[PDB]
Design a protein around this ligand. Structure first.
Ligand SMILES: [Ca+2]
Ligand SMILES: [Ca+2]
Ligand SMILES: [Ca+2]
Ligand SMILES: [Ca+2]
Ligand SMILES: [Ca+2]
Ligand SMILES: [Ca+2]
Ligand SMILES: [Ca+2]
Ligand SMILES: [Ca+2]
Ligand SMILES: [Ca+2]
Ligand SMILES: [Ca+2]
Ligand SMILES: [Ca+2]
Ligand SMILES: [Ca+2]
Lengths: 205, 205
């Protein structure tokens, strides 16, 4: 567990070679260079890797129960093998958002930090939003955020262009507003039909 | 020296074949067709070529001490050999701005006409604005205009995507405002570290 405060030149953290059941690595980037490429690599342990709001973090856990934290910007997450938790603590934009490359059965998606108004669903909330043969990503977003999230934030999801997306609606109108509504990309078609919301924590089934 | 008033159909001025130490050509386009492509070519002389605010002027001096004038729109400047002066008399937008293709040691950049509030630096003002490995042009602009230009306009510069940019901040907030803040593109990496501001006139060192 490495305290990293004030080490702001760091653009590559590579703990990938580390080895035990639980040789657990903790790291938090102190980088504040706007628009930086930062690479964070975990090891065999149950690692805890946090990026920077400033940065386009590529975060990769190894084996084991990794926690990858989103803070802002265009981030690329890969928890390798094991029950990884993708802890989403920022809203992002419509362009600067987190892509999770390898979301699979067992991995979790912790949305506690985007419950702007209240606290998410809590059900098994799992019928995909379906739109027309030529609906745009913009359209699918607007469709997903159609409801009222002013008093209570809601989760929805869809599949566009070969990738899977999750949304948090925290707004009035049927516009997905870049500011307070949130999108999360997941590489590939992953069916979240049967998957359930723990507290505000989605466990993939 | 050709008086050109009222010759508004002119889209190609080609004085390129002209020959002496100082066979000096003066031209000013009278063209007012919105969104026109106008081509202005100088000769061996110390030429004085002005475009149109209306137009996307390609201006090219030959040999000798050419003065190329920016008035508005998407302009492409090439002062050839010699101590050329790129006289910037308009602010432009964030899309319609001047690109200077061949800025080199000896060429000048006359910014007297964009000193909206007061009069520029006057120092040798020369540390490049640096941002992250994947900072956007939008980000670099906002970064460059971060300061307060309300009482006194300030110059800054950066290098994005293989080209060099110069900025004049004439505004309050850290938004580069398209209207009153100004950007100038220079093809290639040109280091303006050591280069100095005359009056409001930057001489490349
Ligand atoms: Ca690991
Ligand atoms: Ca980040
Ligand atoms: Ca893992
Ligand atoms: Ca995994
Ligand atoms: Ca959280
Ligand atoms: Ca809404
Ligand atoms: Ca010439
Ligand atoms: Ca022009
Ligand atoms: Ca020339
Ligand atoms: Ca020259
Ligand atoms: Ca001037
Ligand atoms: Ca400003």
């Amino acid at each position: 567990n490495l305290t990293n405060t004030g080490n702001t030149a760091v653009t590559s953290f590579d703990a990938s070679a580390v080895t035990g059941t639980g040789s657990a690595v903790t790291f938090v980037s102190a980088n504040t260079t706007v628009g930086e490429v930062v690479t964070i690599r975990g090891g065999a342990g149950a690692d805890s890797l946090t990026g920077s709001a400033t940065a386009n973090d590529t975060i990769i856990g190894g084996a084991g129960a990794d926690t990858l934290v989103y803070t802002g910007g265009t981030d690329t997450f890969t928890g390798g093998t094991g029950a990884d938790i993708f802890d989403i603590n920022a809203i992002g934009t419509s362009t600067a958002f987190v892509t999770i490359t390898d979301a699979a059965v067992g991995d979790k998606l912790d949305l506690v930090g985007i419950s702007t108004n209240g606290a998410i669903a809590d059900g098994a909330f799992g019928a995909a939003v379906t739109l027309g043969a030529a609906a745009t990503l913009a359209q699918y977003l607007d469709a997903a955020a159609a409801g009222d999230g002013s008093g209570t934030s809601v989760a929805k999801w869809f599949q566009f262009g070969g990738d899977t997306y999750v949304v948090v609606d925290s707004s009035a109108g049927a516009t997905f507003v870049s500011g307070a509504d949130a999108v999360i990309k997941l590489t590939g078609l992953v069916t979240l039909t049967t998957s359930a919301f723990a507290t505000e924590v989605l466990t993939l089934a």
